[PDB]
Symmetry: C3
Subunit: 190 residues, 3 copies
């Protein structure tokens, strides 16, 4: 069973809006083991009036933080994603997902008396297609481990999508859709 995911077309499961308590967006996240690497796939779909009016501004930053415990399960209290990932094929009760996690050898934490780790970032691009058909590039940053939010967390995966355009993509509400972004990282031992 080499796929850990949200499902292929999830209902609202993720919070983008600052201070909001209920899901307002649909995060599709898929992690597949392939030898010593995880191949990831991620897209975001908006599901509130707030998220679906972000692109009325020419500057947009969308942040999704995922925090995991020692067995690779989402900590929903602190994470943007409010439902744990699941194995495409069921396993025994609390089966470990540690082998899907980003390696703490390859991507360490910035602990107080260690030097800082800039090797923990993956950067790339995906896109937003506006109502009128025009395509806008979104700069993507994935941060692996590096910064613990609290003393309850073992692994970190964060996503930032950024738009700093000349003019707003939209002048009316429209479904926010990030085109799928693929990435690969060195995984923990099973």
């Amino acid at each position: 069973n080499n796929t850990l995911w949200t499902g292929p077309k999830p209902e609202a499961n993720c919070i983008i809006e600052y201070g909001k308590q209920n899901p307002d967006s649909k995060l599709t996240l898929i992690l597949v083991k392939n030898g010593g690497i995880v191949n990831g796939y991620v897209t975001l779909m908006g599901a509130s009036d707030y998220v679906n009016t972000l692109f009325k501004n020419k500057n947009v930053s969308i942040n999704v933080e995922l925090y995991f415990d020692a067995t690779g399960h989402i900590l929903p209290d602190s994470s943007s994603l409010k439902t744990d990932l699941e194995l495409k094929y069921k396993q025994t009760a609390d089966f470990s997902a540690r082998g899907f996690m980003p390696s703490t050898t390859a991507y360490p934490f910035d602990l107080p008396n260690a030097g800082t780790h800039n090797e923990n970032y993956i950067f790339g691009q995906c896109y937003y297609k506006a109502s009128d058909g025009a395509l806008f590039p979104l700069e993507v940053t994935v941060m692996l481990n590096k910064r613990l939010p609290d003393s309850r967390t073992s692994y970190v995966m964060t996503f930032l999508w950024s738009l700093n355009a000349g003019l707003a993509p939209e002048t009316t509400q429209a479904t926010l859709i990030t085109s799928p972004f693929t990435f690969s990282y060195i995984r923990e031992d099973d």
Copy 2:
């Protein structure tokens, strides 16, 4: 057997020129299953005087449409690709390739009384290296499902490569080569 492909160095198998009836280009397309995703690889090589003079213009659009039946086989009549894909390792007569297809749950069709689906696009870049060595970016769009061409088709995968440059890459015929483009998508159940 987890690879469905054209072979690694195919002879001319694809039609680019509008209205032409015989292959004028070599499409390399490779689809590998990896858990719940397909990892794809695609490149195009020109094989006619028409295709190999496209880049004498500063604006170029190259379209390849693939249409598949319910068991994941090419419909050659309507498709740009005129020979079905094959399994790297032979299977039994008309073995199904449905598990290589793009998911109709993740990437639905725009049917008459459904809203339209902009989540069905993957965008990226690959490149053309000109005769003089200069490198040109090609904008790539992959469309999955979304628009049926006719009532005989079950799955769709289309490719668009676009150049809108300041000056033409070429002033003489040269072999059109798109550098390889990789992409991943959520697949149908086997």
Copy 3:
């Protein structure tokens, strides 16, 4: 055993500086078989004062050449990488790594009486994050096979990272880190 690599966090194993005889950089290279393709992952970390002051200039080119024998082992004499890759899981003495190599059918050599092969390049981008936080794009070229350095070599994989910026990213020494670059290619038979 489908992973051939440097290990996930190698010590200095690679030479960047022209004419230097000892390692001055840490190359992370990971090759995973996935059906008929290899999925690759590559990053470079500097480990000398020379490598870690390259980005004080606005124009930077970093070249890494890997040359392999008929069984897919590094030839260290000619290669930038001075230690052979290894299987994540041990095999029998001199187990062949030929199945990780780039296909000579898909990516041929430019031999004297053959036409030249521009289909042997993969191009893309990764990034350098400077001391002050500013992000710089690095143009990446991977060359597969194509040009033999000598008559002792069977396969070639070369990497070029290029920066031609408006202003230097750095004004003091800093650890050179290329953000991870992923690529896929058609592999040789096992």
